[PDB]
Structure 1
Amino acid sequence: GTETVGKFEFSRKDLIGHGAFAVVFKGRHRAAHDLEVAVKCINKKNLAKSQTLLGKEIKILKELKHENIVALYDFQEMANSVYLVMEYCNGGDLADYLHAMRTLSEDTIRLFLQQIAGAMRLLHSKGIIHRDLKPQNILLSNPAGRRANPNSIRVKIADFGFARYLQSNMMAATLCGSPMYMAPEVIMSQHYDGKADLWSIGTIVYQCLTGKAPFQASSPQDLRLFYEKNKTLVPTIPRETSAPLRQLLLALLQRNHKDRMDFDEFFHHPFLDA
């Protein structure tokens, strides 16, 4: 029936989410039932890798407290089980929101990107790269429910199981992330750095604007080959897109990470102001 983790409880009937490496249930605080949580647990179908990823996510999330990072309230790590008690975001993920809305207005995109940028400032200052940014890993919190403004929505980054520290004079080479949101250097099995995350942000923004990822293929292999053959990548951006947002997209969606927008440029882009 009811299972308990510290001061929190959940039942496995309340399944929120399922992946290869985690299973997520809705739960609540045992003493304040109105305080909702999401409890992330091992997926026993991939026991070893799931246990490893959840352990790593605990390590990273312990260091990252921010309004736009889904919060770790508590956790419980044992030899044969791992639980993470997470902030509950009632609005679901950005991918589903985009399906419902079809596209977002530039004003909404600005509101969401300002918030993503604030969380990315904290990762950058800590020397952490996320490596799995995609709309499914952006959660929305809508505390005001049906009576909420656009400004009311809070956006929060989730899933730090693939994140790592990267020393400023080093490069990463681990192949991870989701093919359609992976920087070209990542999917081509090359060395990469924090600018890979900036490509993924660019793809997320493009998808908000158009409803589609910017470069599509019938398979990851085919996407790799496409990136390998095309030295210049220009996403197809709708003609009515404002010039500042267009400039931002083109700077983020640079094939070559040397040419790509860097963090200081992203953080201070005028689109994020007005």
Structure 2
Amino acid sequence: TETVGKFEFSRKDLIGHGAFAVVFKGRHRAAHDLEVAVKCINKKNLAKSQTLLGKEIKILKELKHENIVALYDFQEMANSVYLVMEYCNGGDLADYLHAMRTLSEDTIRLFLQQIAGAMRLLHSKGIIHRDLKPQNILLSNPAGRRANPNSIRVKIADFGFARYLQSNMMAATLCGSPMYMAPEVIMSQHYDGKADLWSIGTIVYQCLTGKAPFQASSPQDLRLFYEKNKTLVPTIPRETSAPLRQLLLALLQRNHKDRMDFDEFFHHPFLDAS
């Protein structure tokens, strides 16, 4: 048992591992039924892990929303950093999609309404996430794992690559997962918040079809494909509802200037459909 302020965890209770973070399930020391996810340095990449966890704190301390994984507390010291986060009892969308293969349009709508809500807050604060992928979309059912799936709440996680972007500036750091990167990101161009909208379009397309809209053998191959193809049209299955078709087509615009803007996303007919 290690303690971080009012919370405790055992390194036995590993729930996830990446190059730059290790995450343990923990609990409040007084309210043992309050589950938490404790994110810790990966000492294999000490300096970068410490930097990214510190940036995550800096960003998440400004973001309170149902659909953003909550930061309950944190502890930054000279040689280590902890984040005590909301525990999402449903795990990640990558694993959920692996088991479900594809999601109904109604489930995609429920999830995307929640992602849109979180993105409204990021956009209003001037923050871009830059690492949206299914592994960073977490699921939580307030009625418990075995409850009605209509009750699944979605939370954006992993803000270590996030930044403020001034409205007259562009970003240029290579961030994210290549299969979810906007073309402008993987082509090492300048980009803005619309790069996240491409990532969201890729996630929605994967939910709908079970595959990438633009398949490639490697990140290098995907970059070459984007470089060579100045128009990108995803194949929309003919059973797709018109609002979801139009949402996908507008998000998966190769050129960020042509891509759906945030106001269009937040008010998209797909999101207000019954």
Gaps of 5+ in 1: none
Matched, 1:130 2:126: no
Secondary structure in 2 aligned to 1:179? coil
- Within 1, Cα distance between the matches of 2:136 and 2:211? 16
**Which stretches of structure 1, 4 residues or more, deviate above 4 A after TM superposition?**
none
Per-residue CA deviation, residues 3-32 of structure 1 (Å, 9 max, x unaligned), is: 000000000001110000000000000001
Structure 2 Cα separation of the partners of residues 247 and 149 of structure 1: 29
TM-superposed CA distance for 1:204, in Å, is 0.4
Which whole-Å deviations, capped at 9, do the CAs of 1:107-160 have from their partners, x for residues lacking one?
Answer: 011000000000000000000000000110000001323552233110000000
- Give me the whole-angstrom Cα distance separating, in 2, the residues matched to 1:145 and 1:29: 18
Distance 2:10 2:79 in 1: 19
Taking only aligned residues, the RMSD between alpha carbons, in angstroms, comes to 0.8
- 1:87-114 alpha-carbon deviations (Å, 9 max, x no partner): 0001000011011111000001100000
Deviation, 1:216, is 1.5
Matches within 5 A, 1:235-254: 235-254=234-253
TM-score of the pair, normalised by structure 1: 0.98
The alignment of Structure 1 onto Structure 2 pairs a total of residues equal to 273
Change (3 A) 1:146 1:174: closer
For the 8 Å contact 2:20–2:52, the answer to whether it is kept is yes
Q: Distance in 2 between matches of 1:116 and 1:253?
A: 17
Distance of 1:90 and 1:146 partners within structure 2:
7
C-alpha distance in 2 between matches for 1:255 and 1:208: 20
Counterpart CA distance in 2 for 1:234 and 1:10 is 47
2:197 and 2:40 map into 1 onto residues whose CA distance is: 29
- C-alpha contact (below 8 Å) 2:89/2:145 kept by paired residues: no
Structure 2 counterpart SS, 1:145: coil
Question: SS of the counterpart of 1:209?
Answer: helix
- Report the TM-score when normalising by structure 2: 0.98
Deviation at 1:239, TM superposition (A): 1.1
Tell me the secondary structure at the aligned position of residue 27 of structure 2: strand
The DSSP-based 3-state class of the residue aligned with 2:155 is strand
Mapped partners of 2:29, 2:175: distance in 1: 37
What residue ranges of structure 2 are gaps of 5+ in the alignment? none
Q: Distance in 2 between matches of 1:247 and 1:136?
A: 25
Measured in 2, the distance between the counterparts of 1:64 and 1:146 equals 26
Which residue of structure 2 lines up, in the alignment, with residue 148 of structure 1?
A: 147
Distance 1:36 1:84 in 2: 13
Change (3 A) 1:146 1:35: closer
Q: Counterparts of 1:150 and 1:253 in 2: how far apart (Å)?
A: 28
- SS in structure 1 opposite 2:179? helix
Listed one character per residue, the Cα deviations across residues 185-233 of structure 1 (whole Å, up to 9, x for unaligned) are 0000000001000000000000000111111211110000000000111
